[PDB]
Amino acid sequence: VKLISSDGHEFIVKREHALTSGTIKAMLSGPGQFAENETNEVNFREIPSHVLSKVCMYFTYKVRYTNSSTEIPEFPIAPEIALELLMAANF
C-alpha cells in the first residue's frame, strides 16, 4: 500500500497491517471504482501529509490494539487534532 499526499509525500504501509485495515470498513468503497491500480498508488487530494501521518499511525495502532494490544487503554485523548480529521467528513 503506497499512499500519496498532496505534498507529494509517499507513505509505504506494511501489508501485515494493511490486511487488518482492509477488514475494517474504510472509504475504499466511497468512490465509484477502486481498481487494483488505485489500491497500489493511492493519491489523496487536499489532504496534507501531516494529518495523513496521524491517520496512518492511528490505523497502525488500531490494528495492533484490536488484535493483541487490547490490554492497554484507548488512544490518549490529549492532542485535540482528531476532530480536524473529522472535518473531511468523507473519510
Residue ranges that bind other proteins, judged by CB under 8 A: 8-14, 16-17, 24-27, 30, 48, 50-51, 53-58, 60-65, 69, 74-91
Q: Identify which of residues 35 and 51 has a Cβ nearer to other proteins in the complex.
A: 51
The CB-of-12 to other proteins minimum distance in angstroms stands at 4
Phi and psi dihedrals of 48, rounded to 5?
Answer: -65, 150
Name the grid cell of 26.
474504510
Shortest Cβ 28–other proteins spacing (Å): 9
Count Cβ atoms within 10 A of the Cβ of residue 5 and give its class: 0-12 exposed, 13-18 middle, 19 or more buried: buried
Q: List the grid coordinates of 44.
A: 489523496
Q: Shortest gap between Cβ of 35 and other proteins (angstroms)?
A: 19
